[PDB]
C-alpha cells in the first residue's frame, strides 16, 4: 500500500491503435566543445585564395 514499482510495461500488439503502436525514436543533439570539431558534413572542400 502506497509502495509501487516505478516502471511498467508497454502493451505492444500488432492490432493496437496507431496511437498505442510502437514508435522508434532517435534524437540528434549537436555539440561544440572546448575541443576540436571532428564531426563534419559531406560538403566538398576547396583550395584557399
Amino acid at each position, epitope marked *: 500500500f502506497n509502495c509501487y*514499482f516505478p516502471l*511498467q510495461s508497454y502493451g505492444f500488439q500488432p492490432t493496437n491503435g496507431v496511437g498505442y503502436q510502437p514508435y522508434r525514436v532517435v534524437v540528434l543533439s549537436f555539440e561544440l566543445l572546448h575541443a576540436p570539431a571532428t564531426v563534419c558534413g559531406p560538403k566538398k572542400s576547396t583550395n584557399l585564395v
Partner: nanobody
Amino acid sequence: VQLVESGGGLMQAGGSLRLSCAVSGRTFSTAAMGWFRQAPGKEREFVAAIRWSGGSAYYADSVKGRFTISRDKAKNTVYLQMNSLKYEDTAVYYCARTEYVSYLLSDYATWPYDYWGQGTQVTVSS
C-alpha cells in the same frame, strides 16, 4: 523457453516440502514468477507471485504464514517453501512466468501468465 518443476510429492500433514521451477532457454527479461495449483475437479487457483526485480512477494490468503516464495536470479529458479502442510494443499502445482511488468504487485494474482510448467503433484497424508 521451458519451465522445469521439481520437488514435492508425498508428505504427512504438518510437514514441509520445497518446490523448484528452473527457467531454461534464451529470455529477454523476466518480470515475475508465480505458483498456481489445481486440486482434482477444482479450478486452477493462484498461490504466490514474486517480482524478479527486488523480490517482493504476493500470496493467496489460504497460504499466508505457511508458504514462502523466493527467487535465485543467477540460477533463474523460483521456489515455493510449503510449510505446515494441510490436506487442502493436495494438488498439482504449476510454475508460471511473465515478462509483463505491472507497477502493482497484486496484479500478479490475476494476470494471465505467458509460460507454464508441466505441473508437480503434492499429496498431503494423515
